Structures are given as structure tokens and as C-alpha cells.
């Protein structure tokens, strides 16, 4: 309120993890949306809402297609930071 | 006060030193390092208690890394160049339908986690559907190749009987035993990859054996007696040719 | 009171018995003995027997004679 | 502190004009005799004979040039598979003798007089749909003759 | 009558039999049976305990009770067929499997 | 001469380090310095090595004691089934391992099953592995049983056996074999060690609390009510050379490792002949 | 997840969409078998797992002498007799939370003072 | 060690030698000190050739 695939990719994010590496559902979703452009329809649960969810749909044969999309998503989608740079400690 | 425990060879005393080796017939799972196609391996150093001692080590390989799609399970069989997808091996063994195959690997029908991990293997072995076609597929991959249809299917039979899991039995009708074992191995391979069990401690003393004066002489006497046995045969030919008594 | 719990000094009475029986090189001797009394026989019996077969040309006498000779290994002795 | 007991005399007859065998079917093949009406159980002699190559001055030949002849091998009549044809169109099973040590399960059968008679199991055969079996190749036939003897 | 026909009488009147694993030493004593061929008694006590005991003459020995361990014959279907001195017949279906334990 | 007849060679993960599994089996101090350091092991005083027995009497025993053979296994029917192995050969499964394990243990402690045979029951993993196998290093430990009419969990061996032995010590009829067949003491290899729970001292680590000397070292407690075995003597963890070191518990770790190398080069009477 | 097999083949089932009636089925790729789906969920990944924590809790758990005991009163039978262990999920991350198994009622209770369980 | 209960992260279990050399070490303290002691002997042994070649 204020055409697409019947197959849904639904992922649950960890509130505790989403905080230590400061992130918003909005900004996470934005990365996915900006990665797959107009060939993936993304919706997401609000930062307020109890469970943290991202609902995704594509634009015969679709099962394997989505299993590739979830691998791209977990392994290739960079949210924050610079590549090769892990564990950043603050030091006085 | 002299305590014995040595030999006297040409007048000097000699002590056999115990040699430490890794115990055989032992299932061990190890994570194969960061740059590798295979993420984890199930190894079994199968050898006979006595009799020739076939040092054929079976590797059950989990292809694909933690975060790679199509994580298949293949196994390198003695005298076979390629690693055969587990499924085809079970089929060549006689365990033909999926789920009958899955029953040998996963023991809990509830455990969806391990079962999803077996779906790729089922897809990999989907091509081969009967026992015969499984043995041909194994027979195709030589050896050398050994061209002829009757020949390759007959060869697969022999490898599974004589070179595959030689402890247990090297006898004929024991497919059921060797299938459940392979399934116990895949169970252990997946159990470690699912982070439920720890990688095997290669340095646990319980997994090491000490070859003392006994077995050392036994190892030597074997190769020394087969040296004599096959020199008598060379004589029986020489003395049957000329009937030289 | 022959069923009274054992003290710490008593563990030495057991250790005394362990060594009275086994000695300091039980491993070396017990291994060799096992090899002489048992292992040796089984090594003579695994491959053991060897045969040679002489099958003829089946033409005519002195052909058409097929033979098989055996050589067998039984008990093993050691002086 | 109370038990109901039934006791039966057991005889082991040295007399006997029969041999008792076991016919075993796998649960997966779902065998139900109720559907049976007529059955034919006959031995399989397809592999009656079998010719196997056998190895036959001068130096002994290298393996690549060894000389061979052939030998006829006779299968024990008792070492032949059984062939079960049920209902004329219908089911057909092949029974293969179980490979085992010289020990045998006893069959306990009830007699009209009420006592049990026990007999040694002569042979144990595993029967499975013929569709699971294929024309024995020379290799398999040879491998079979060996197992049995 | 017609050769090859498996006389299904035993299975048609649904006769049932027991398949028992017997220790070799016990079956060897049974071999010494004479008279009517009797060797002992099979006891079934319920409240279920099944056991076999040799008779006094056959045992020549102190009395013992061989317990039976009942087992399932589920994973498959077992039947008994006999071959006379030449007729073939399915005399019975294994209704119970058990192991006679040494004692 | 003694320490040479107890020497171990290891040819070729982290082999040189002293592993926990080396407890009571190999000397923690007797090892060379340089190149061969930690690859040349020296056997502790009470260590023995399994000669290798026959598996069949045990396979025959197992089947007879409730062991369903693998040839007839149906995983979903018996899903909690304890899988039974004899020398890495899976023979079948068993429904009540608790009772089987006790029978097998009584078989060994009687002598019916050889004492050099190793049998382990990993409850969590639902497995029972048996080893008739040659080459396994074992050590003897005192058996402790909850079994005592009068009170707690107490070490089978009593002051009566002790005098029964010292009677035979004065004769130079009650041997080490006598303690072994009377099931007072047992042989435990490293794999079996995994499933047991050992007390260091018997007396000090048995009856609970119902001033204290300051000069003595700080010691822990007998909190365990689970104790299956007791240590004959903790000093037995040491090999021939380290066993001549006076107060090795008062030296820095390597200084001990040094002495168990030097004493081998010390002069004296080697043999009376 | 929890998946089914084909009755007739025993071979596994592959999902097929019935485009016409907009519903999920499971087809057998060895025979002509088809069956409607029980749940809409076909695949579950699970990265932050909790399945492994209370593994191998055979009723014989009390017979392990290697296991430590505590006088913690049970939530069910209130028995101060129990054996304890840590998350058997052999991962690096893993918390040092303890799982107590009752030596009477067999109920698995934890020491977790951040969260509340049922496994 | 087999003298400890499982999942024991106590100082006494993970190798804390509470005692002075003057007082003496418990068998557990003795073996743990022995493990720790062996580590140094290993690097002393190895370093020796690694260090030598660096020099060259
Ligand atoms: Zn199907
Ligand atoms: Zn409770």
C-alpha cells in the first residue's frame, strides 16, 4: 500500500549480529535490491518488528535458480567494509 | 642381572627398536585446508591382520567448500583413477533405490539437516539406475580402461570384492556389510562437516601402534618366505623339464 | 580385618608383584614368544602350498597326459 | 508369583524321508502367498556346463605368452539356483543358496499328538524377483562355480 | 502330482513353524537319542519365558535350562519347503524365530 | 642398557609434543634434545604392549549375547541401537549395551576374555569398539567399585590381599596374575582410558570430610563418586632413566629431561660378568 | 524440512508446480508417481544452528563416570541429582552454557540466564 | 587427564601449577609442567637449524 515468481526466498537476520556490526533492515535490503536490480522483487520486515525477515521473488524450471541466488546473496553480497579487511579493533 | 631382550648376531648384541605407526582399519575425518576443492575427507587405512597386507587407503571426499553450491560426495576406490559418487558405489553394491541408500548413511529419519546434505549425491548418482550400469560406470574408469563391455563390468565386481574395504571380508556375498560401513563413513564425514563432531586427533596415542620384535620379524619373514616359496617353484619347472628327480 | 581398605604404602607391595612376574622387558620377550609359538606357523600356512600343472598336447602317446604336482607345508619345528 | 505353563515333548527323528529347507523373501518385494494358487518350483540348469581356461627344454614363458587349454567344470546339482514361477503371466523368483558355515538352524514343527519334532535346516535360499536377475555372463557363472566349491 | 508343482497344502491350511538357532553341542547330544526319539521338553511360562531342557536319559548330566531369546522375523518372510526321497511342498511359514542360548 | 630396551622410534600433526594420551604409557622427561626430540619415546615402568589375540571367541560370544548381525540391520526399526565393532570391522548392533558391557567386563576380569583385550563404551556416540589387536600400549590400574555393603565406592584390593602378597615376598603362591584373575587390577590402553575416571591416591582420594600442615604441597580432592579406577602409584608415569632422579617434582621440567640422557653416559658396573 | 520418498520406487521426490491450480507437488523421476506437498517449505538453510547442543542423550547418560554431577534442583521433579555437559555443537563461537540431565525425570534444563529453552 | 571430570575449565585442570618448586608438584602439575617444558625443547631443537640457514 503506502507478474512475478511463485517461489519465495525467505531469510531471517539476527538482531544481536545486526547491531555489533551496526546495520538497519533498510540498508541490508538496499544492498540486495541494488545487487540484483530489476530481476529480483525485495520486501523487508521493519527494524522495530519482532522477527527480522527479507522476502525475495524473481521477475518453467525455477527451483535450482533460487538456490544460486541465495549463494550469490550470502557469499558475494558485501554490505559494509572493504574487501580483505576483517576483525577491526579500536586501540588507544 | 642381565635381563635379556636382545639377539646375538656375529657376536654383537642387537636390540630391536619398537617402531611406531598409525593403527590401521581406522575411520578418521579431517578438514582439508582453505585452498582445496574438497572440504573434508573420511579416511580408512584398511589392511589385513596377516596375509599379503593390501595397503589400500579409501578416501570418502566431500567436494565443495563451506559456502559453495553442489556439495557432492565422491570416493576414491583402489585401482580406479576417478573418485566415484557414493550413490553409484551403493548401487554397484546392490542397494539400488535412494532412501534404501540414505538408510545406510543417516540413521535418524528426523535429521533433515544431514539429509538435505545428501540430496546432491542422489542427483549425482541419478544417471545410473541398476547394479549392472553402476559396475560398468566403475569399470569404464580404469585400471587403464581395459576396453570391452563384458570385461569392464566383470572387473568392477573384483575391485569391490578384493580391493574395496579388504578388512571386514574379501569374500563374495558381503555387500550388505561393506554398504553399511561406507554409510557409517559418510555419517562420520557429514557429522564433522555439520560441526557436531571434532576433526580426528592424528596424535591420539590410542590410535597408534607399536611394532615390536614380534611383528618386525613377522614382516621380514613374510617377504623372506615368499622369496623362498617362489624359488622352489622356479626349481620345480627346472626339474620337471628334464625329469631330473 | 582382611577386608580393610588399602593404604598408600601398600601400592608398593602390588608394584613389587608386577615386577616379580613381568620383569623390565616383558614387552620384548612377550612379543618374540608370540611370534615363535604362533605367528611363525601362520606365516608358513598363508600362501604355503604351491602347485605346477603339466597338461599335454593330446596328440597321441606319448601325448594326451595331463598332470598336477603338489608341494605342501605342514607343522613347523624349531630347535 | 503365579505362572501359566505349557510344556511340550521334543523329538529329533533320525527317521525322515524329507529334507527341510528355508525359502526366504525380502520385505521390499512384498510377497503374499494369499495371491498364490498354483506354483512351480524347479531347478535352474541354464549353467549346467562351463568351460574355463586353464594354464598348460625352454625357459618358462613371460606372462604375455603363457599357454592355455580348457577344462569343463561340473556344477553340483545341489548348487543350482531354484526357479519359482507363481500362477502360471505372474511373478517369478530366483532362489540363491545362502553361503554359510556347516551349522544349520533347526525347524520345530508341531505333530498331531501334540509334541514337537525338530529337523536340521538342509539349505537356506534367498528368493528375489527375476527382474533383479540377469542372464549370467561367463565371468559370473565361473565366479559362481568357485564360490560353491 | 504334476512334477514341478509346489504342493501348497502346508501354507494353505496355514501351518506355522519355529526357526531355532541351536548350539552345536546341544544338537550333538540330541544325536544320541533313541527310543521314540525324545530329547527333552520345550517350556513356555507366561505371566513370557521360553526354554528347553534335556531329559534325564539324554543328558547323563546335571539339569540345565536353555533359555530362548525371541527375535523378530520381520525384515523378511520365511517359509519351509521340503523335498522327499522327490515331491516338493511348502509345509509351513516361520511364525517365530528364536535363538537357543547355551547354558 | 635398561632404557635402550624400552626405546621407541617414530619415523617422519605435532608429534614432538608430549600428548595427554602419553600419561602412564610414555615418560614425559626421557626424550633427546635436538632433531629426534619428542620422536624418540621411552616407555613408563608399568607399560606393556598388546601381543595380539584372536577375535573369533569374542565375535562368537557377542552374537550369543544379544548382538543383531549387520546383514539384517534395519536402521529405522532399531534407531538407538549401539553399533558394535571388533578391530574396525562393524559386526552388528545391540539393544541393551549396559548389560552386555558388564558381561564383557566380567568376562575379562575373570580371565575368560583375555586381559590385554581393549573394550570401550562411548555412551553419547552409541558405540562399543573392541580390540584384540597387536601393538596397543597398556598400563595396569586398581579397580574401584561402588560395590561395598559397608559404605561408599571402594578399591577392590584390601589389606588382606596385601599381606597375602607380602607372604609370597617373604618366600623369596599369590602372584600379579592372582590379582589380575581375582579382578582387583586391570589393563587399560589409551582408547579405553577415555571412558574411565581415575583417583591418584587411594586412601587420600576415597572417604569424604565429616590443623593442616603448611610445608606439604597444595592438593585437590575426591569430589568424584563416579571413580572406576585408581592409580597404583603416580611415580609409575616415569621411565627407567627418570626413575633415578631424586625429587623430580622439585625440579624445572627440562633439568629432569637432561638427567634422563646423562645417566646413560654415567660410569659404573654395567654387569657383574 | 522433513522430505518424503516415492511409494513404488522408494526413490526421492523432486518438487513440481501445478501451474493450473497453483499448487505444489512431489514427482518421482523414476516412475509416474506424484503427490501433493504437506508444507510450502521446500528448502531450509540454517546458518546459526542450535541442533547438536543436546545430542547423544541416551537414558544411559548417568552411566558415564566421566560426566560431572551437581546438586541443582530440577524444574520438573525437583531432584538435586543430575549430570552436566556443554553445547555438543563442536563450533568455535559456541557459548559455555550448561545442559543438566535429570538422574530421575530425564528432563534437560540449562544454566542460561539470558534465554529460556525446551530442548 | 582421566583424573578429571569432563568440561573442567578450572585452573587445576588446564595446567595451573599452584605450588613452588620448594613445596613440590602434584602428579597432574608434574605432567602439565612436562608438556609445557617439552614445547621449549622442541623450539630450541628446531630454531637451531632454521636460525643457522638464515645466517648463511
Ligand atoms: Zn517412483
Ligand atoms: Zn527431574
Curated annotation (Swiss-Prot), chain B:
Localization terms from the record: Nucleus
Gene name of the encoded protein: RPB2
Chief place of localization: nucleus
Transmembrane spans: none
Keyword Zinc: yes
Biological function: DNA-dependent RNA polymerase catalyzes the transcription of DNA into RNA using the four ribonucleoside triphosphates as substrates. Second largest component of RNA polymerases II which synthesizes mRNA precursors and many functional non-coding RNAs. Proposed to contribute to the polymerase catalytic activity and forms the polymerase active center together with the largest subunit. Pol II is the central component of the basal RNA polymerase II transcription machinery.
GO cellular component: cytoplasmic stress granule; mitochondrion; nucleus; RNA polymerase II, core complex
Whole sequence portion shown: 197 to 441 of 1224
Superkingdom of origin organism: Eukaryota
Claim: Iron is one of the keywords in the record: no
Note: The binding of ribonucleoside triphosphate to the RNA polymerase II transcribing complex probably involves a two-step mechanism. The initial binding seems to occur at the entry (E) site and involves a magnesium ion coordinated by three conserved aspartate residues of the two largest RNA Pol II subunits.
Biological process, per Gene Ontology: RNA-templated transcription; transcription by RNA polymerase II; transcription elongation by RNA polymerase II; transcription initiation at RNA polymerase II promoter
Protein name: DNA-directed RNA polymerase II subunit RPB2
Gene Ontology MF term list: DNA binding; DNA-directed RNA polymerase activity; mRNA binding; ribonucleoside binding; zinc ion binding
UniProtKB/Swiss-Prot annotation, chain E:
Signal peptide range: none
Coiled coil: none
Domain of life: Eukaryota
Modified residues (Phosphoserine): 3
Transmembrane segments: none
Subcellular location: Nucleus
Described purpose of this protein according to its UniProt entry: TFIIF is a general transcription initiation factor that binds to RNA polymerase II. Its functions include the recruitment of RNA polymerase II to the promoter bound DNA-TBP-TFIIB complex, decreasing the affinity of RNA polymerase II for non-specific DNA, allowing for the subsequent recruitment of TFIIE and TFIIH, and facilitating RNA polymerase II elongation.
Family: Belongs to the TFIIF beta subunit family.
Subunit structure: TFIIF is composed of three different subunits: TFG1/RAP74, TFG2/RAP30 and TAF14.
Remarks, miscellaneous: Present with 520 molecules/cell in log phase SD medium.
Protein known as: Transcription initiation factor IIF subunit beta
Organism this protein belongs to: Saccharomyces cerevisiae (strain ATCC 204508 / S288c)
Lineage: Eukaryota, Fungi, Dikarya, Ascomycota, Saccharomycotina
Residues of the full protein shown: 54 to 227 of 400
UniProtKB/Swiss-Prot annotation, chain G:
Function of the molecule: DNA-dependent RNA polymerase catalyzes the transcription of DNA into RNA using the four ribonucleoside triphosphates as substrates. Component of RNA polymerase II which synthesizes mRNA precursors and many functional non-coding RNAs. Pol II is the central component of the basal RNA polymerase II transcription machinery. It is composed of mobile elements that move relative to each other. RPB9 is part of the upper jaw surrounding the central large cleft and thought to grab the incoming DNA template. Involved in the regulation of transcription elongation.
Any single Gene Ontology cellular-component annotation: nucleolus
Species for this entry: Saccharomyces cerevisiae (strain ATCC 204508 / S288c) (Baker's yeast)
One Gene Ontology term of the molecular function aspect: DNA-directed RNA polymerase activity
Keyword Ion transport: no
Further comment: Present with 2440 molecules/cell in log phase SD medium.
Positions of Zn(2+) 2 binding: 74, 77, 102, 105
Protein name: DNA-directed RNA polymerase II subunit RPB9
Isomerase recorded as keyword: no
Zinc finger (TFIIS-type): 70-110
Phylogenetic placement of the source organism: Eukaryota, Fungi, Dikarya, Ascomycota, Saccharomycotina
From Swiss-Prot, chain H:
Subcellular location per the Swiss-Prot or TrEMBL entry: Nucleus
Region (Bridging helix): 27-39
PTM entry text: The tandem 7 residues repeats in the C-terminal domain (CTD) can be highly phosphorylated. The phosphorylation activates Pol II. Phosphorylation occurs mainly at residues 'Ser-2' and 'Ser-5' of the heptapeptide repeat. The phosphorylated form of Pol II appears to carry, on average, one phosphate per repeat. The phosphorylation state is believed to result from the balanced action of site-specific CTD kinases and phosphatases, and a 'CTD code' that specifies the position of Pol II within the transcription cycle has been proposed.
Domain of life: Eukaryota
Assembly with partners or alone: Component of the RNA polymerase II (Pol II) complex consisting of 12 subunits. Interacts with DEF1; the interaction is direct and serves to bridge RPB1 to the Elongin complex in a DNA-damaged dependent manner. Interacts with the Elongin subunit ELA1. Interacts with the Elongin subunit ELC1. Interacts with ASK10. Interacts with ESS1. Interacts with RTT103. Interacts with SHE2.
Family listed: Belongs to the RNA polymerase beta' chain family.
Domain free text: The C-terminal domain (CTD) serves as a platform for assembly of factors that regulate transcription initiation, elongation, termination and mRNA processing.
Name of the featured protein: DNA-directed RNA polymerase II subunit RPB1
Source organism of this protein record: Saccharomyces cerevisiae (strain ATCC 204508 / S288c) (Baker's yeast)
